[PDB]
């Protein structure tokens, strides 16, 4: 009535209840109906959220994701649960089981990737396990033994197959691989995607989320599915993709996350006495991608830019991805201060009409801003979590705390939505999103 | 390491995670392996624990229990889950599906009852629902519409078939119906139970809990199962039980709980405009059983006594059941003060060697005291919860708070055991007991 | 910026800081500039707020107040601080030092009384002290040893000198004795006060609080100050007041507080082995003022009425004092349900325009309602505290909890105002009021 | 009885109460009787603890200290309260009023300095003020307007007059300037101090703290007081101290604090548009003292060493000051990992007999260890605070969190002692120390 908000203990109870309720056994769905399968970076956040509840079950979540790793090392962005429809495109549309020589043996997966936040999840699992004493340390350490090789292959595939020219930036062949499907970041590269004879299909996402203003448009889905056809024609071969894909972009946010991930995994590798050549490689990649992100930045404002490889041009947009260099470090001192002024100013977290001091996915003063439409404007708790966690790693303890405080205040209604209207705070999209529950559990401690 | 305790937010997350993890779908198991079925007063506590998480799912728990209600109104103490063994005695041993004319149609149940804390669970569901606004009120109110008649039949069967002589005390035909299976309260009535040709059996409880000191003895289980044979020979007929049962005791704690339950249900009946004749009946029974409890009490100390109907004599023991009149009210002023001095003194919560200021199931200075052996000594969070909740109803706000505080401190290790060693605090019995998680969730708010 | 509220630990620290900052040494000012002396029922609340900080200093607050008790047992409503100016009427205007035979020696006080919340403060000090160990328990028990007799004289003076006809209601000779200076309760009685030659004077209160809408009018002060002249003319003699005072009312809210206080003090006397004759007297007065309160009640709603002794007529007004019977008990069951419906419904706590679910001092739908004007409408935390504490004592734990919760939400701006606009929540009157900080400290525990 | 600890809100309220109770008006005593004056780095911590209570009063604390700054820029380590006795050496013994050309007018102070934590307090005040709205931000920014120049003079006096050879390490002329009076760090330097005709005196400190084991010896005080004679003989002249002082050491912990403070103050100067030349100087000193600290470090463990300027030899001792490089950064990566292993391992935080996971002032396995004797072993909350705050600044959020958490667990008895027995946790020295209450308030947020 007068106050729909939950106390911190009630909120944490409700978050954990949701995470257990989305558990199919060995995998957690990203959202009950909209996303009834295991998604890659959702799964990393799910492991973070499970680590305060059960280190064993947190490890099981990453074990399950890594059992779907491709033979070349790629972690695919969807691992389908057996016998669940209601999500399109499903395994039949991707047909990776048929066409992809590198697809895993006893798992149905997608044929594209997603950002490598997994090392961050490993770090949080270990930190939790170190507070719970010997028996629980052993579980976390036995996981390292079993899966260090697989994490290395994941990072090595990113470093070697998606950074072919050693530019220190990750090439994507689908906007879906960025995690920000309809970000304004990809508008001009999608504008050069002309579909051919695209086999018939029926959207399923917008039977669940029926507001047209909160999901991508039909025109946008026709480009998304057409790119799948181009990958399928080359049997998802890494070598042939540069030659065929109509969409090839260097994703500076994905690159900054990879840089952080390598640094984190390198430190884990040192503390647990993993092979020295692996630690050296991880430190090498963290520096290469840190430098690769810095090379994209505006020399005045520090804002990071994506790069359209096909058009051979810098993509200038006003989204939250501009702040990638804040995550990984590396900017000159003056350029970083300017970048923090942009973050805190009226074009983003300082905008006067925002309900919370949180980072909007697109700047509200940008011509591309749409307050309800997914990544074109709404506020995402997963960005809040990622920025706050990276900010604290930079030593910016008070910036990290303020983002955490406002994220808890936004989440304190218990909707656990993936994104929120930035002016009114209305939950948008699907409720019961596992990784919002995870972020809340991590923040509450 | 230095401190295995969880923060209040971590504890509440872990409690809710456990409650969701014990959910089979429509019922919650009392404990994963030891009690892999739905138990009656555990189920009431489970509903209390679920009400802060989901009023819908809390209502579903009570709906499921009430679907197993017998045709005469009795709520049986076990509702078996389909296809689960590992618990003895199971449905085949009870054979209620064959023999009991009143057994429910499409449910396997036991053939005995357990204390009526269910109205208390209904009260907590309603109080939660009133803080969550219109949609959630409707769910709680629609439950009242569907199940008020069934709750009335439950209370009426207790009042009419287990208080045949209108003495205002509940007769039990099995120590299991008290919830305190091996309490010293029943030793002398069990001593007059001589088993006959008792069909062969194998205990299953002590394959799971293998410490012999924490479960009842083999000699005690032979009496428990022999009483089942006596009920089976009369096909669980209410009319014939007084004529055949070797164990017939008036349980003063069960009676005090019934008195409170009637009072609570009567107030619910008034606030939601249920039939006036039902409210009148409930108030009648609450007073009759309040008086029935007071009639058992020592005129000096106020301690309540059980009554062995067969031996026709008062049972004097030093267990927590002595404090039944504190729950329901009714004692003269001086007698109640004396009873509170007994509770707070060195024979119970004031005993110098107790780790927490909590109520031991048997007095530590009693000859019957056994520090590890189930109801002969250990501390049970479910008694802590019940006393604290009833104390606050009496207006004893600070006594209730102190019991709550110490219960949270004991539970703060996250074992969620049903009972604890009273001197060392060691968790005993089964971990992951649903109703300890429920008590914690209720207390934390 | 985005969130003006403090966290619970920040709020608690700011409340304790305010209380120590208003400490003059052995007495706490009620407010820094508006009320720069010790007020009697503020000092009871200050004692409650000091108890979690220092039992020694809480006892000192009450010792200081009781050292200013009159020879006939009356506790005056102001104890003036040595040398302090800026409040009118000051010691010069009261002239109790010269005129009042019963006034204390070497303490300057006023010449009227105020409600007897003091036993409640004594209970909260004892409950705090029992959690703190032996030396702290000794401090509290030595305070009882030396002031029990003074507390009895206080209650005996009320029962014998302000209830001379043993009606079980307290007569007041000044609206300031009710604690609700300008309440609509007193308007018709004040209409019969006709000042004669009133010696001139300048207000001090509205030089500090200069908004005219938040304090009484000049016309009201003329009547307040004339009643002082009438008392002085008979040198504050108890026996002469009924024959000379133009204001003589029975205060049912004061009477219900006294009923509760007698019962509280009686229970203390039993627990700490005080003279049996004293405890009997206290229980006798508890019951008599309970009956006196209930005798006033509306036959349909159970609402309590004040009584004008000179006019011999019931005073019907729509203020929070109507709910007096909820505090002390005594209504038949159906009338108490009606009275709680009145409290929770749209004339009081459930009015739709109210920011908080709290009790306005006057009904927002009464024609006497004024949203800014002191006791004519604003929400007072002291009343929130009293009802919540009294409701918990009645055993209405959820109702007490909801009041506490809204009270803390209102106070979380750290204003510590004594009253608040009911619709906007704007803090009114003086900031830095000790008894609001005290309420907050008691609630946060 | 069963649980001596306070809840977080009770702890916070008791800390704020202590801080206001030690407030003399415009300065806070360090301790009520032991240290009844303003100490310089306590006053920085007091300012940190006041910031969540009152930004205005926090600023006043720093204004009062800076009004006692010497004409050459030095902040003296004691500012004496007008008319206050009971601490020796008092203003008479220092005689700075008569002898010291640079001493302030109309403030009595000591004649030595103390570590420069003050910029850290300024940062915490600014961070608090930015969360509180415009008028509060104006208070903090007006404080910078009027004291920025004084803060620069402070840092410039340290860099130019106590680092005359631009070695990037601060020279001390008295162990009291380190803040660690009787630390084993200084024993070999104090062995070269040979008192001549020392004017007689009586200790005041051990009349308050009478256990001989918790304070320095008479022999140590004879040396402390002789160094005062040497300073007075040259009238506290900076230029003459190197030629006459028998104690001259480079304090690496002080130097690392100064490095951090310069960098903090430089960032403030950038954010608030202070003169660019000032910010350049601050970053220059930050780097120079960082390098000076690292130059001292053990080549295997990275542990920092103090330097005895008269003996020209590195001082190797096993105290917490060895961890200075963790505060300011600068170690190569592999040496910092070794130093953190030393900190967390069995010689310091991981010693098995330690009650809390906190940093003992001397290693429990060193032969200089004494568990009760001031800086020779006990655990100090101020060090816990400094390392946690500095660790968070390095980006080691989990390490900073674990220190905070153990610090709060140690403080939860409400003793507010300045140091604690490391094995039993017994509070030692004076209770009611302001800077421990300050630490607690900052941690609880």
Short mmCIF file of C-alpha atoms in Angstrom, two decimals, chain C residues 62-321:
data_model
loop_
_atom_site.label_atom_id
_atom_site.label_comp_id
_atom_site.label_asym_id
_atom_site.label_seq_id
_atom_site.Cartn_x
_atom_site.Cartn_y
_atom_site.Cartn_z
CA UNK C 62 14.71 10.40 36.27
CA UNK C 63 16.56 11.24 39.50
CA UNK C 64 16.78 14.88 38.40
CA UNK C 65 13.06 15.03 37.63
CA UNK C 66 12.10 13.32 40.90
CA UNK C 67 14.34 15.72 42.85
CA UNK C 68 11.95 18.43 41.64
CA UNK C 69 8.80 16.61 42.87
CA UNK C 70 6.57 18.72 45.12
CA UNK C 71 6.07 17.91 48.78
CA UNK C 72 2.55 16.62 48.07
CA UNK C 73 3.82 14.17 45.43
CA UNK C 74 3.10 16.12 42.23
CA UNK C 75 5.70 16.00 39.43
CA UNK C 76 5.72 19.51 37.86
CA UNK C 77 5.71 19.75 34.12
CA UNK C 78 8.75 22.03 33.80
CA UNK C 79 12.00 21.89 35.76
CA UNK C 80 13.85 25.05 34.77
CA UNK C 81 17.54 25.02 34.09
CA UNK C 82 19.65 27.35 36.22
CA UNK C 83 20.06 30.70 34.51
CA UNK C 84 18.30 29.77 31.24
CA UNK C 85 16.13 32.38 29.45
CA UNK C 86 14.21 32.36 26.17
CA UNK C 87 11.13 30.37 27.22
CA UNK C 88 7.95 32.12 28.44
CA UNK C 89 6.36 31.58 30.95
CA UNK C 90 9.59 31.37 32.92
CA UNK C 91 10.04 30.87 36.67
CA UNK C 92 9.33 34.55 37.37
CA UNK C 93 5.83 34.30 35.87
CA UNK C 94 4.96 31.06 37.74
CA UNK C 95 6.26 32.42 41.06
CA UNK C 96 5.98 28.93 42.58
CA UNK C 97 9.25 29.59 44.42
CA UNK C 98 7.50 32.34 46.42
CA UNK C 99 3.88 31.24 46.50
CA UNK C 100 3.71 27.44 46.44
CA UNK C 101 4.07 25.93 49.92
CA UNK C 102 4.69 22.51 48.35
CA UNK C 103 7.30 23.55 45.77
CA UNK C 104 10.76 21.95 46.10
CA UNK C 105 13.76 23.68 47.62
CA UNK C 106 16.66 24.64 45.33
CA UNK C 107 14.85 23.61 42.15
CA UNK C 108 12.76 26.02 40.09
CA UNK C 109 9.68 24.38 38.56
CA UNK C 110 6.32 25.21 37.02
CA UNK C 111 3.10 24.75 39.03
CA UNK C 112 1.07 22.27 36.95
CA UNK C 113 1.56 18.61 36.08
CA UNK C 114 1.74 16.38 32.97
CA UNK C 115 0.90 12.76 32.03
CA UNK C 116 2.47 9.92 34.08
CA UNK C 117 4.50 8.08 31.43
CA UNK C 118 7.33 7.79 33.96
CA UNK C 119 6.63 4.18 35.06
CA UNK C 120 6.90 3.16 31.36
CA UNK C 121 10.39 4.70 31.25
CA UNK C 122 11.26 2.80 34.44
CA UNK C 123 10.18 -0.46 32.80
CA UNK C 124 12.32 0.22 29.70
CA UNK C 125 15.35 1.02 31.87
CA UNK C 126 14.91 -2.24 33.82
CA UNK C 127 14.50 -4.30 30.64
CA UNK C 128 17.67 -2.75 29.18
CA UNK C 129 19.55 -3.28 32.43
CA UNK C 130 18.71 -6.97 32.71
CA UNK C 131 20.42 -7.55 29.34
CA UNK C 132 23.63 -5.80 30.44
CA UNK C 133 25.10 -7.71 33.37
CA UNK C 134 25.44 -7.42 37.08
CA UNK C 135 26.85 -3.94 37.64
CA UNK C 136 24.23 -2.44 35.33
CA UNK C 137 21.44 -4.38 37.09
CA UNK C 138 22.76 -2.99 40.38
CA UNK C 139 22.46 0.59 39.06
CA UNK C 140 18.83 0.08 38.07
CA UNK C 141 17.93 -1.69 41.32
CA UNK C 142 19.59 0.98 43.44
CA UNK C 143 17.47 3.55 41.57
CA UNK C 144 14.33 1.60 42.53
CA UNK C 145 15.55 1.38 46.12
CA UNK C 146 15.82 5.13 46.41
CA UNK C 147 12.94 6.33 44.20
CA UNK C 148 10.19 3.70 44.61
CA UNK C 149 8.70 5.76 47.42
CA UNK C 150 8.76 8.90 45.22
CA UNK C 151 7.08 7.09 42.34
CA UNK C 152 4.33 5.90 44.71
CA UNK C 153 3.78 9.47 45.99
CA UNK C 154 3.46 10.59 42.39
CA UNK C 155 0.77 8.03 41.59
CA UNK C 156 -0.94 8.53 44.95
CA UNK C 157 -1.10 12.29 44.35
CA UNK C 158 -2.85 11.73 41.01
CA UNK C 159 -5.30 9.15 42.46
CA UNK C 160 -6.13 11.12 45.60
CA UNK C 161 -5.79 14.80 44.61
CA UNK C 162 -6.81 14.83 40.94
CA UNK C 163 -9.47 12.10 41.35
CA UNK C 164 -11.08 13.46 44.54
CA UNK C 165 -14.47 11.91 43.77
CA UNK C 166 -12.93 8.50 42.89
CA UNK C 167 -14.46 8.69 39.41
CA UNK C 168 -11.40 6.99 37.92
CA UNK C 169 -10.62 9.98 35.71
CA UNK C 170 -7.92 12.65 36.20
CA UNK C 171 -9.03 16.27 36.53
CA UNK C 172 -6.85 18.90 34.83
CA UNK C 173 -6.76 22.59 35.67
CA UNK C 174 -4.86 23.61 32.52
CA UNK C 175 -4.84 22.26 28.97
CA UNK C 176 -1.02 22.23 29.21
CA UNK C 177 -1.34 19.37 31.69
CA UNK C 178 -2.79 17.16 28.93
CA UNK C 179 0.37 17.62 26.91
CA UNK C 180 -1.88 18.64 23.96
CA UNK C 181 -1.88 22.41 24.43
CA UNK C 182 -4.18 23.56 21.66
CA UNK C 183 -6.11 20.35 21.04
CA UNK C 184 -9.74 20.73 19.87
CA UNK C 185 -10.56 18.65 22.95
CA UNK C 186 -10.28 21.82 25.07
CA UNK C 187 -11.89 24.51 22.87
CA UNK C 188 -15.30 24.56 24.54
CA UNK C 189 -13.76 24.56 28.03
CA UNK C 190 -11.39 27.40 27.05
CA UNK C 191 -14.40 29.35 25.75
CA UNK C 192 -15.48 29.70 29.42
CA UNK C 193 -12.11 31.13 30.53
CA UNK C 194 -12.59 34.93 30.78
CA UNK C 195 -9.34 36.79 31.60
CA UNK C 196 -9.53 39.64 34.09
CA UNK C 197 -6.60 42.05 34.58
CA UNK C 198 -3.95 39.88 32.90
CA UNK C 199 -0.43 41.23 33.60
CA UNK C 200 1.20 42.02 30.29
CA UNK C 201 3.75 39.76 28.62
CA UNK C 202 5.55 39.00 25.36
CA UNK C 203 5.53 35.55 23.79
CA UNK C 204 8.91 33.84 23.37
CA UNK C 205 7.74 30.70 21.55
CA UNK C 206 6.77 32.37 18.27
CA UNK C 207 10.05 34.30 18.16
CA UNK C 208 11.72 30.89 17.65
CA UNK C 209 8.96 29.27 15.57
CA UNK C 210 7.82 32.27 13.55
CA UNK C 211 5.32 30.67 11.15
CA UNK C 212 1.99 31.68 12.78
CA UNK C 213 0.27 28.53 11.45
CA UNK C 214 2.41 26.14 13.54
CA UNK C 215 1.75 27.53 17.05
CA UNK C 216 -1.30 28.62 19.13
CA UNK C 217 -2.81 32.07 18.68
CA UNK C 218 -2.39 35.12 20.91
CA UNK C 219 -5.96 34.61 22.07
CA UNK C 220 -5.13 31.10 23.23
CA UNK C 221 -2.03 32.27 25.09
CA UNK C 222 -4.08 34.95 26.85
CA UNK C 223 -6.19 32.13 28.30
CA UNK C 224 -3.20 29.92 29.12
CA UNK C 225 -1.61 32.78 31.03
CA UNK C 226 -4.83 33.74 32.82
CA UNK C 227 -5.16 30.26 34.33
CA UNK C 228 -1.72 30.86 35.90
CA UNK C 229 -3.09 34.01 37.59
CA UNK C 230 -5.97 31.99 39.06
CA UNK C 231 -3.60 29.38 40.49
CA UNK C 232 -1.23 31.96 41.91
CA UNK C 233 -4.12 33.73 43.62
CA UNK C 234 -4.63 30.66 45.81
CA UNK C 235 -0.87 29.92 46.05
CA UNK C 236 -1.24 26.66 44.11
CA UNK C 237 -3.15 25.08 47.03
CA UNK C 238 -4.71 21.75 45.96
CA UNK C 239 -7.76 22.17 48.17
CA UNK C 240 -8.67 25.54 46.68
CA UNK C 241 -8.32 24.86 42.95
CA UNK C 242 -11.84 23.33 42.50
CA UNK C 243 -13.41 26.52 43.86
CA UNK C 244 -11.39 29.05 41.86
CA UNK C 245 -10.22 27.50 38.54
CA UNK C 246 -12.13 28.50 35.36
CA UNK C 247 -10.86 25.35 33.59
CA UNK C 248 -11.62 21.91 35.07
CA UNK C 249 -11.73 18.91 32.76
CA UNK C 250 -11.39 15.16 33.06
CA UNK C 251 -8.74 14.03 30.56
CA UNK C 252 -9.51 10.54 29.38
CA UNK C 253 -6.20 10.10 27.57
CA UNK C 254 -4.19 11.11 30.63
CA UNK C 255 -6.47 8.78 32.65
CA UNK C 256 -5.78 5.79 30.36
CA UNK C 257 -2.03 6.46 30.50
CA UNK C 258 -2.30 6.48 34.29
CA UNK C 259 -4.15 3.15 34.23
CA UNK C 260 -1.34 1.58 32.17
CA UNK C 261 1.35 3.23 34.32
CA UNK C 262 -0.19 1.89 37.55
CA UNK C 263 -0.27 -1.62 36.12
CA UNK C 264 3.31 -1.31 34.87
CA UNK C 265 4.54 0.06 38.19
CA UNK C 266 2.63 -2.67 40.05
CA UNK C 267 4.40 -5.39 38.04
CA UNK C 268 7.76 -3.77 38.77
CA UNK C 269 6.87 -3.75 42.45
CA UNK C 270 6.11 -7.47 42.35
CA UNK C 271 9.28 -8.37 40.42
CA UNK C 272 11.49 -6.33 42.78
CA UNK C 273 9.78 -7.20 46.06
CA UNK C 274 8.43 -3.76 46.93
CA UNK C 275 5.85 -3.41 49.76
CA UNK C 276 2.76 -5.48 49.06
CA UNK C 277 0.48 -2.64 50.19
CA UNK C 278 1.95 -0.46 47.45
CA UNK C 279 1.39 -3.06 44.74
CA UNK C 280 -2.23 -3.54 45.88
CA UNK C 281 -2.85 0.21 45.69
CA UNK C 282 -1.36 0.31 42.18
CA UNK C 283 -3.50 -2.57 40.89
CA UNK C 284 -6.51 -0.93 42.51
CA UNK C 285 -5.86 2.36 40.71
CA UNK C 286 -5.10 0.52 37.44
CA UNK C 287 -8.56 -1.03 37.51
CA UNK C 288 -10.37 2.14 38.66
CA UNK C 289 -8.94 4.34 35.87
CA UNK C 290 -9.56 1.57 33.37
CA UNK C 291 -13.20 1.61 34.43
CA UNK C 292 -13.28 5.41 34.44
CA UNK C 293 -11.99 5.50 30.86
CA UNK C 294 -14.52 2.88 29.61
CA UNK C 295 -17.39 4.67 31.29
CA UNK C 296 -16.83 7.62 28.93
CA UNK C 297 -17.04 5.62 25.74
CA UNK C 298 -19.44 6.05 22.84
CA UNK C 299 -21.83 3.10 22.84
CA UNK C 300 -21.42 2.45 19.09
CA UNK C 301 -17.75 3.21 18.26
CA UNK C 302 -16.20 2.78 21.72
CA UNK C 303 -14.57 6.21 21.32
CA UNK C 304 -13.63 7.87 24.59
CA UNK C 305 -14.86 11.35 25.58
CA UNK C 306 -13.32 13.97 27.81
CA UNK C 307 -15.61 15.57 30.44
CA UNK C 308 -15.95 19.26 31.28
CA UNK C 309 -16.43 19.37 35.04
CA UNK C 310 -17.72 22.97 35.18
CA UNK C 311 -20.20 22.58 32.30
CA UNK C 312 -21.04 18.98 33.36
CA UNK C 313 -21.01 17.81 29.74
CA UNK C 314 -19.23 15.24 27.61
CA UNK C 315 -16.76 16.75 25.14
CA UNK C 316 -17.15 15.08 21.74
CA UNK C 317 -14.24 15.85 19.42
CA UNK C 318 -12.47 13.84 16.73
CA UNK C 319 -8.90 13.62 18.02
CA UNK C 320 -6.47 10.82 18.74
CA UNK C 321 -7.37 10.94 22.41
#
